[PDB]
Amino acid sequence: MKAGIHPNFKKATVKCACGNEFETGSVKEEVRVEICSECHPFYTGRQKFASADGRVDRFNKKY
Amino acid sequence: RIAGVDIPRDKRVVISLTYIFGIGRTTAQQVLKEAGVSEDTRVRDLTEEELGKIRDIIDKLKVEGDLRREVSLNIKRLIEIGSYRGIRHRRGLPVRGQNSKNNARTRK
Amino acid sequence: SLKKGPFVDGHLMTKIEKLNETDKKQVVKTWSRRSTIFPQFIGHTIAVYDGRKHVPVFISEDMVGHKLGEFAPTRTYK
Amino acid sequence: NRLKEKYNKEIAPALMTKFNYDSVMQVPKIEKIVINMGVGDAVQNAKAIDSAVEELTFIAGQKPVVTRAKKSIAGFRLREGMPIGAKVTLRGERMYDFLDKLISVSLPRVRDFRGVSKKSFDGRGNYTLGIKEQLIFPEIDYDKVTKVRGMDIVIVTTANTDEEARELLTQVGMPF
RNA sequence: CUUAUGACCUGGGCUACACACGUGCUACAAUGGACAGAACAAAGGGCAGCGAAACCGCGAGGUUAAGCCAAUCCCACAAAUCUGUUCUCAGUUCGGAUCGCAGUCUGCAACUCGACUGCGUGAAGCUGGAAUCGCUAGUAAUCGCGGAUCAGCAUGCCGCG
Numbered sequence: 001m002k003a004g005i006h007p008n009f010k011k012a013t014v015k016c017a018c019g020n021e022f023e024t025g026s027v028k029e030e031v032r033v034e035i036c037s038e039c040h041p042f043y044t045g046r047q048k049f050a051s052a053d054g055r056v057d058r059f060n061k062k063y
Numbered sequence: 064r065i066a067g068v069d070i071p072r073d074k075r076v077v078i079s080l081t082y083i084f085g086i087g088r089t090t091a092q093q094v095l096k097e098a099g100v101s102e103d104t105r106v107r108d109l110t111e112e113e114l115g116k117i118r119d120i121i122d123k124l125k126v127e128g129d130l131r132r133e134v135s136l137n138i139k140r141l142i143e144i145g146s147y148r149g150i151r152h153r154r155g156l157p158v159r160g161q162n163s164k165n166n167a168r169t170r171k
Numbered sequence: 172s173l174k175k176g177p178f179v180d181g182h183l184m185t186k187i188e189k190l191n192e193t194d195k196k197q198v199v200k201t202w203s204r205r206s207t208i209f210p211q212f213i214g215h216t217i218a219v220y221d222g223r224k225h226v227p228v229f230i231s232e233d234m235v236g237h238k239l240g241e242f243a244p245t246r247t248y249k
Numbered sequence: 250n251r252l253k254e255k256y257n258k259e260i261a262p263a264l265m266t267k268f269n270y271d272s273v274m275q276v277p278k279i280e281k282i283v284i285n286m287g288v289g290d291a292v293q294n295a296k297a298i299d300s301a302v303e304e305l306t307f308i309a310g311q312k313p314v315v316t317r318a319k320k321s322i323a324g325f326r327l328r329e330g331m332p333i334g335a336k337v338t339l340r341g342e343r344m345y346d347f348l349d350k351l352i353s354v355s356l357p358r359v360r361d362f363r364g365v366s367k368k369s370f371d372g373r374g375n376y377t378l379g380i381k382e383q384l385i386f387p388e389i390d391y392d393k394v395t396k397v398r399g400m401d402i403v404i405v406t407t408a409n410t411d412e413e414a415r416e417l418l419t420q421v422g423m424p425f
Numbered sequence: 426c427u428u429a430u431g432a433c434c435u436g437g438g439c440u441a442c443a444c445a446c447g448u449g450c451u452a453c454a455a456u457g458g459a460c461a462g463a464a465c466a467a468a469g470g471g472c473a474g475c476g477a478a479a480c481c482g483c484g485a486g487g488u489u490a491a492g493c494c495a496a497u498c499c500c501a502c503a504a505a506u507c508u509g510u511u512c513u514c515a516g517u518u519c520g521g522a523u524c525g526c527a528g529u530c531u532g533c534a535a536c537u538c539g540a541c542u543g544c545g546u547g548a549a550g551c552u553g554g555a556a557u558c559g560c561u562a563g564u565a566a567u568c569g570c571g572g573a574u575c576a577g578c579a580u581g582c583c584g585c586g
Contacts, residue, residue, distance in 0.1 A: 006311035014353060017115060022353050023251050025346045027310055028388045033354050034064070034118075040357035042364065042424055052123045055133075059210040059235035063174050067360040069391065075511090078518055087545060088459095088518075089483095103511090128361045130545075134525050141525090144233060146241045147536070156442080158524070160538060163442045169523050169548060171443090178534055202435050205534060222437025222537095240536040245437050 065117070066126050076106045080117075084127035094120050177207035177236075187212060198227060204240035219243045252345045252421075260420050268413065277374070277408045277417055282344045284309060285316070285401045286335035291325040297396065302335055304394070308385055309347065313337035351402075352422040355385040364424045374408025376418065377401070 012026035016036035024031075037043040041050035064070055070079045080091045095102050098120065100113035141149040151158050157167045180203050187199055188211075195214065202220045213232050218225040221243035228242045261276045270276065286305055288297045298315065305313045313335040321329035339347050356362060359382060369377050381399040384391065408414035419425070 001311065007306055009310040017118070022349070024349055024353065025250075025310075025342075026350070026386065026388070027307055031354065031386060031388050033387065035357045037353055037357055037422070040362075042362055043357065043422075050122060052125060053129075057233060057235070061174070061177055067358075075518085078512085081518085085545065087547095090544070130525090131361075134546085137525065140233065144231075145228070146237065147244055148241065150244070152524085160440075160536095161523095162440055164440085165442095167442095167523085172528075172535075173530085174528090180533080203534095204436070204536075220436050238536050243437095243537095245537055246441055248441070249443080 066121050067128065070106055072107045073105065076100075076104045076109070077102060079106050083121075085125060085130050086121075094124070177209075179206035179209070187215070191215065200225065201239070204238070204243060206239055208234055208237050208239065210235050221245050250342060250345060250349075252349060253342070260417070263420070264413075264417055267416070277406050277413050279344065279348075279404055279406045279417075279421070281338055281340050281403075281405045282347055283336065283338045283403045283405070284313070285403065286313065286398075287401065288334055288398070289325070290331070290333045291327055292331060298332055298335060300396070301398075304383065304389070305335060305337060307389060308383075308400070309337055309339060310343055311337065348404075348421070350386050354387065356424070358384055358387065360384075367425060370411045370414065372411060374406055374411055374414040376404050376406075376414060378404075 007027050009025060009027060010029065012024055012029050012031065014020070014022035014024050014031055014033055014036075016033040016039070018036055018039045020036045020038050039050060041047045044050060047053065065080065066083060068083045071082060072079075077088070077092055077095055080086060080095070081088055086094070092102070094117070098113070098117045100109065100116070104113075138152065142153055143149070148158055155171045156163060157170060161167060183199075183201055183203060183206060190199060191212070198216045198218055200218050204219050204221070208230065212230050213234070214230065216227050216229055217239060218227050219239050219242070222245050226243050228239075261273075265273055265276055284305065286298070286301050288301060290297060302313055302315065314337060315332045316334040316336050318327065318329055318331075318333050321327055327333070356365075359380070365378065371377070379399070379401060382397065383389065383394050383399060385400070404418075406414050406417070408417070
């Protein structure tokens with residue numbers, strides 16, 4: 001580190017909207033996260049609990 | 064922000080959530096009424112829980128990251144499926160039976 | 172587009188279900204480009220009149236809800 | 250830091266049992282993350298790189314380096330000597346800090362996300378990623394960004410084959 | 426010609442599309458737009474027809490259905506207008522073009538090739554060159570409303586205030 005030419009680096013915790021924690025550093029001090037890796041559905045393993053999904057080819061005129 | 068896309072911050076929330084891809088005015092207003100968060104708010108100075116309880120309802124309806132691709136897949140299905148409608152889509156000619164003599168500069 | 176069922180002409184039906192009942196193989200003739208496709212004619216082939224010539228076309232699985240007139244372009248271009 | 254603790258505790262033992270290494274320090278290790286800015290400059294405006302530099306010093310923890318063009322090519326009207334693109338390498342606790350931000354906040358915040366590419370490898374255990382948006386961590390002041398050119402992400406490991414890097418990056422946390 | 430320039434039948438075409446011309450419609454906005462409320466016309470049509478109220482459906486419409494061969498009943502809640510709230514001058518709460526999805530009606534049948542509804546998407550266009558037209562007051566300009574043609578289809582026409 002040539003001092004002065006780098007911005008300040010310090011501990012900066014994470015608050016996701018779901019309330020998950022992460023012991024993080026950043027140039028800022030605090031980050032609000034709308035969606036984390038435990039609730040965004042692709043990193044929920046595979047669509048664990050975030051889904052409104054499905055697709056069929058339905059051919060139904062029986063009413 | 065809300066669902067990926069940011070929001071113009073100084074306007075009313077009912078006008079502001081129509082900038083996202085997937086809800087118009089009428090569809091926005093009724094989910095906003097179900098949200099129950101006033102429906103006459105400036106989005107610049109609302110609070111976080113009334114900000115966040117709409118996330119779950121827009122998750123169970125559908126927006127750009129899914130509508131864009133499903134309409135794309137359906138329309139290329141219509142393309143390579145061999146339809147007259149599909150080949151009109153391919154060639155840029157109008158689809159809803161409009162006359163090509165005098166108009167349709169909106170396409171081509 | 173009405174919920175009393177899609178509309179076809181009966182005589183072409185009778186031959187095509189007896190066709191797919193006993194022997195799926197060969198082609199079926201028509202002059203009527205009007206019948207809505209039913210999802211139980213997958214895999215066959217139909218010679219549809221375009222107004223000038225009978226044209227064969229193959230029906231796949233996703234060919235549902237349309238009519239057989241969608242695939243015999245009556246007018247040509249450059 | 251947390252990732253370093255997990256890598257020391259569980260990641261490296263699991264894979265060293267999995268590849269049956271005789272010497273336990275034959276373990277593949279992620280060596281350098283380098284972030285390379287590229288501007289389509291060609292003498293259009295000097296301030297594009299003069300904005301990207303302090304944008305990237307906010308994205309990372311320190312100042313980047315303005316890359317030097319090697320030779321002139323007039324196919325872009327690129328005269329040799331005027332600056333194009335920026336670069337910064339990250340290592341130490343800094344690399345784990347950045348990968349932390351990546352996995353935790355960044356990729357879930359992309360406008361559309363499917364799984365990361367299956368075979369972006371070099372063939373010799375290195376990986377390259379291309380992202381289109383500057384919106385990596387949400388406390389960039391998003392109103393100040395004007396141009397939309399995203400970032401180039403290069404992770405370098407001691408992996409000799411593609412398979413070891415492919416397997417280790419899974420427990421790092423890259424979706425596929 | 427009667428072994429077709431005459432008949433019959435099905436399907437297609439009369440709706441195509443690189444361009445141009447004309448006639449119209451609609452916009453480019455705050456003398457506005459959205460939302461609520463308050464009103465105020467004439468002139469016509471209706472029996473294989475108009476179809477009330479009520480109920481269902483967000484809506485197109487659907488259901489049982491009252492009355493009327495009509496100065497009784499129905500079509501049929503006129504709109505512009507006025508009052509109030511909001512929007513705060515932007516390609517926009519302007520403009521809605523074109524598309525995807527789901528439907529409504531009619532008709533044997535809505536693909537070529539109908540109209541309408543709920544959706545989502547949202548185009549160009551921020552007053553238009555050379556030119557050029559109509560119009561002497563209930564006129565121009567705007568505002569709706571009927572009728573014919575008619576299974577369904579009108580920005581066209583005719584007429585009404």
